[PDB]
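Ticket reopened. Same input as before:
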Amino acid sequence: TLNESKFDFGTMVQWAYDHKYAEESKIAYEYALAAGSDSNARAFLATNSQAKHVKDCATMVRHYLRAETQALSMPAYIKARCKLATGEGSWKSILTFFNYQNIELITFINALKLWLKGIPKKNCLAFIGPPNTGKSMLCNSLIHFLGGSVLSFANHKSHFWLASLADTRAALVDDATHACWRYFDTYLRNALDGYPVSIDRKHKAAVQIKAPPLLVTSNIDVQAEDRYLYLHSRVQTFRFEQPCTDEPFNITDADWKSFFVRLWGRLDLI
Amino acid sequence: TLNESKFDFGTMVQWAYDHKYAEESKIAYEYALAAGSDSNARAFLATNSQAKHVKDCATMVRHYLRAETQALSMPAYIKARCKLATGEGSWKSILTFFNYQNIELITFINALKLWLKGIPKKNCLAFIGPPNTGKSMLCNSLIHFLGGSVLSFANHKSHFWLASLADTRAALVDDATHACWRYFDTYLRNALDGYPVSIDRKHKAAVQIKAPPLLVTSNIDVQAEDRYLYLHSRVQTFRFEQPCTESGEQPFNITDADWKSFFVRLWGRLDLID
Amino acid sequence: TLNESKFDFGTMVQWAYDHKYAEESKIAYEYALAAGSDSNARAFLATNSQAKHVKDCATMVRHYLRAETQALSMPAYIKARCKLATGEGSWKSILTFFNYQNIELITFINALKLWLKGIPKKNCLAFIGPPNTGKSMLCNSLIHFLGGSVLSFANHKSHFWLASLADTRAALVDDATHACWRYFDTYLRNALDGYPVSIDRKHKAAVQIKAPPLLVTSNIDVQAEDRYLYLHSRVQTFRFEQPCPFNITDADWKSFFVRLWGRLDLI
Amino acid sequence: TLNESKFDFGTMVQWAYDHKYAEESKIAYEYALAAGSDSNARAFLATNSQAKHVKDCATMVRHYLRAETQALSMPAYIKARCKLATGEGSWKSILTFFNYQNIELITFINALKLWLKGIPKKNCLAFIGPPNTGKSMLCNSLIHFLGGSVLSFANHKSHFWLASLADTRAALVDDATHACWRYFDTYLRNALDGYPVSIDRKHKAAVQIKAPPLLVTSNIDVQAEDRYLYLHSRVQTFRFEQPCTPFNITDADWKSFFVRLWGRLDLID
Amino acid sequence: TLNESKFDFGTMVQWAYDHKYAEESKIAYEYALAAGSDSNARAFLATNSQAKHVKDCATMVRHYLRAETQALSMPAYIKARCKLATGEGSWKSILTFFNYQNIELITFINALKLWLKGIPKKNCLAFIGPPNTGKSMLCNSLIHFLGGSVLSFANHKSHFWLASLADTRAALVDDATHACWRYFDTYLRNALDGYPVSIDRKHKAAVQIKAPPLLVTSNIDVQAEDRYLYLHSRVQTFRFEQPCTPFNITDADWKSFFVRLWGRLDLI
Amino acid sequence: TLNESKFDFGTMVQWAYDHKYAEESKIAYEYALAAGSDSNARAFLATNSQAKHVKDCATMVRHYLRAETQALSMPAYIKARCKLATGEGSWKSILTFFNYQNIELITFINALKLWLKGIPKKNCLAFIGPPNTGKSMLCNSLIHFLGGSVLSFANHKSHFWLASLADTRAALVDDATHACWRYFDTYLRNALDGYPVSIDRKHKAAVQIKAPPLLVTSNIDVQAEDRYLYLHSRVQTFRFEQPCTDEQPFNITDADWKSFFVRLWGRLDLID
Ligand SMILES: [Mg+2]
Ligand SMILES: [Mg+2]
Ligand SMILES: [Mg+2]
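Engineering reply: fixed in the latest deploy. New output:
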């Protein structure tokens, strides 16, 4: 990784942004390789304050990626995620699965439509059923396509476990336990009703935001439980009953792309 | 975007202040956009210390914004908030709602007049009743109009969860559970009173300040509960009993313009004069 | 506000000190205003380092302010506090109120005389009774007159919640609940006693310092409670039984101290 | 040592990288030595900001080294672990150990092959048996060879215990207690199934990642206990029955193992 | 005050050292005062980096002061402390008090002699009894005379609550509650014995240092309690039973005390 | 002291290293005194950044010292530790003490031989008994002689408490309680096995090192307790039952160990 034999920070930040590198060690290493055929990368290794620049650069790119994701409307955002979708699947892969899980495409399309706008009480789609019915399967594939984030209720003892809600456009709380559902009930009523929540971030002061769209998976039916009365009118549920087990379903990013490109009209994304 | 290519800090701050951009990412990104037709934004992308300038800009803006909000009296402040609101509105929306909850508007007016002045033991209004009675609805609309902040009891194990009290002119805790009331009872009587309190802020120094007016929504009626005895005298309760939804429509929705109408109409009786 | 447009730091500090502006936001903003008719304020908005100047200014002003407060004897200090108060006032307001609570003013004068000197086991006065008996009312007015600080037990899980004790000449804990009394009993007897106490400051290192005089208000009568046995000796209790609202101003206290100067041993 | 007397930082970093020194103290010391014969090292000692340069050099090196290893394929990584490990080595060492515990070698090779590929349900090999059957012995030896990390699940207090997973190519859970298995059962199905998990770290932001391959050692046979029904298809148990008190597996043993069985572990690059 | 208007750092440090000003706020303020008749203090208010200078000055003075204190043996140190004390004083004040508590002064002298040497298992003296028996009174007067530090168990949840142990020659814990005694029992046996301990300091590296001689006042009799068994051996207890407040030991009293009992306290 | 009226930092570091001053307090003060003769020390006192220079100097020094110390073999190290120990002393007092506790010195020697090489399951020696049996004093004298560190379970809630396992050649946990033994049982297993573990820092670097030979003193007998079964084979226990409750109590010193090590150098397999 030859490191030896006037530096503009702009040019570097640019390069990092273009390549979507946000992480210092990557930025550092990757720019050092570019220096074979890049004058500014060559000038960088001549600098004494490399470590400072690598840091700054990460901070710079982290600022931009974060703030452009926030700036785009939900349609433009989905549009962006469609462009990122490589390979080729089909929206049919998705329909086939719902058919298998005996749920209405139409029900889903509506739910999703309103979930995407983050309309109050329509902001949270639960995917409920016993183990191995492809709940994780579908939800994670959707989050992936969407550029979402997974929240782990394991980390709930720290209140920072919600930090990413100040960032994503969609979020998934995987495998909800009772603990977790009543957590929702206790603390997050406002996330469901589209009122503001103070989300604490680690190295800087907390921010007040509207909680982005939420997915949940669970073995637990909230609508069928009395102790979660508040949740009934705020959580849209879908039950999966059907096994997915061979030593058959794998929704891809292109599957979702086709799904959105094709039902774009029906999802009110115009 | 284009992030690439002498800089004056003040100008960037001027900019950020004008656009009321206070938050680092927005400041950096939004300015990087201004780069196309602003030589200062172009120069910003030429320096090696952009990260720091963004950082300092946010500090500077926050300083100014806080400072100007604290300087204003309640009247002058509400005045500026009225100036900010837009759209079609009427105080009748508010009247209708209180009337729907079988509460005379004057009862609320009397309470609000004192609450706004932050008079001791009158510094806290709680809206209380069964689910879906428009409690969060009303309180949030008001807090929004006032530019107040929401406190999130989910963050209460942190020292800094109260940090906003050093800045806003009104504050809301939405859906106070039993754990929540107890915390308030044990640790926060005098803030509920609107007495001076030491508010700890993250990176900065603790600040001693008059606790701003408080709003609470809750399913728990503190006045009826013997175990919250000591909260009875410092919390004025409004009981919302009537449903504000079937899950067909939601008929009651108060806008900023409704409050603008409200304060303008009732400027006199809320003693917000000279 | 205008934020755009050779800078001298000292002049900015001078300014900040003069106006008693000690906090960064206020300093920054208020100085940016002075910019219309102040070349140094103008020059401040021209520098690319204004962020740290505001920071340093705040630091510098609190250094001075703290240092000048600490330097004054209690008499000299109260003197300056009297100078500061304005408006119409009378110690009678205070007499009336203690009389209303069926307490002779002299009982309070005696206790206060010692409390001000920060005499061990006498460093803490507690105002105790059922709700709405003007406990917080009185204590807060006094703390205000004195320029003392409020302690917020709510922050007690932090290391720095006592940090003001390194600066003020008097402190108040308003509405001590059982949890509050217990914490004090367990951890802070010496603080109550007004003995030297190690006080953790946020970014600076700790200081060993004598703890200022203390005021507490509470519904809990510590004197009557066997489980707060060890607090009985270090806390003088004033029972406020009568309800009410009535108000004590700074000018009332000014009148109070001026009138009772000699009787308070303030030489 | 001499620490007395124009400096180019990159040159130092270059040097440090070459000798694989990621260690402030080591860096500082070694440079100050390589200095009566390096114009730059001399120049370094002339500078007043030496302390800063050492700190930066470390940072810079640990960046490069970390980033260069993160970028390898699993096969390429093992090839690196093979270069890195030297000594008296034979795989005969391991084969007899398996033969002693009555596990067929091929059962293990296969399992490892699919494990190194982090295929879901093939992502977590448990080694199970009563105290003192060389479970730690073997797993530590392997994880060491591979440069993976060791995790201890205490109880509640273990909040950040997974923090290393954010970074290693492989990991070992040392003596899974029953509660540790319940933790998997409750919170880790996604990790085992190939899905992202949020991993909380100390004084930095949480990360989301695919869980590295896991080794577990326990006295608790999860295949037997129905209260862990959901792990049965996700965890592959190797049972160690025989007590051992001599056997000892080394970096050099694993090297020989991997080189010998390379084609059979499907590492073809 | 005036803070407005070539600066030598060393001179400010010299000044600060001379006046024993160790505290940023005091250093800043007190120097800004010296500005009327000191060209260096004037120059200080001309620099734009005065904030850093105040900070570095305190650091610097702290360095020197610490280093001086650490260099001296116990005798030489007490010597310096005696030199510092002023006023009318008599060891008889101390004698009378111990006699009032029905304790022979020699009992205290014997214990104090060893305590001062920081001999293992003898490094901790505890003054114990019902309220208002002059416990805090006495221990505080001594800790003051010695220039020792108070530890505040209130801050024990912090890593640096023991940071002063890297600097002072004697330390006091005033009113040890049950929570206090337990913490000591669990975590600080070695510190009570006066063995080395790793002391965490704010902007500095940890130092391993002999925990200095300890004083404790308390209402709790550790020797009588079975659950504080492991403290019995490392804690010498003086029981103060008789009520007092009048009784008031000054620095000059201690000066008299050490001067009189120099040989008898073995201070060669 | 005098701290008043170009500077070269390397020169200050040279001085500090030679004099082996690694604490800022000392570096600061001592260099200030050396200003009369040495005129770099003079330059130092004329800089406005004196404070930083001290800070950086301490850093720089302790870097070097840590680095030479790791480079040494255990043999060569103990040698330097003997070279460092001063005063009159004898190994007899070590013999006297074990014999007092009814233990053959050779039981101790054997253990120590293996413990110094850091052999798996021999890496930790424990001295276990009722209060007042010479446990702490024996261990401390050894650790002191060895230049090792004393870990404080007080700060255990922050992993940073093991930071010094990165630097020192031997460590002592004085007076282990149940809480502390449980800690070993879950975390420090690998330490008792020769397999490297990850040590953290306040100045976050996050290294991995083989764990130094450990000493523990305790009123708790681990071999007697099942909740500590793992530790049985990995902790070598020396039971001290005889009390020393009767001006200056018994005392082992650096010189006592110095001779102990010079005399028993052979038998301890320290040969090279
Ligand atoms: Mg009150
Ligand atoms: Mg006392
Ligand atoms: Mg012991």
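Chains D and B do not touch (no CB pair under 8 Å). The longest strand of chain D covers residues 171-176. Please confirm and we'll close it.
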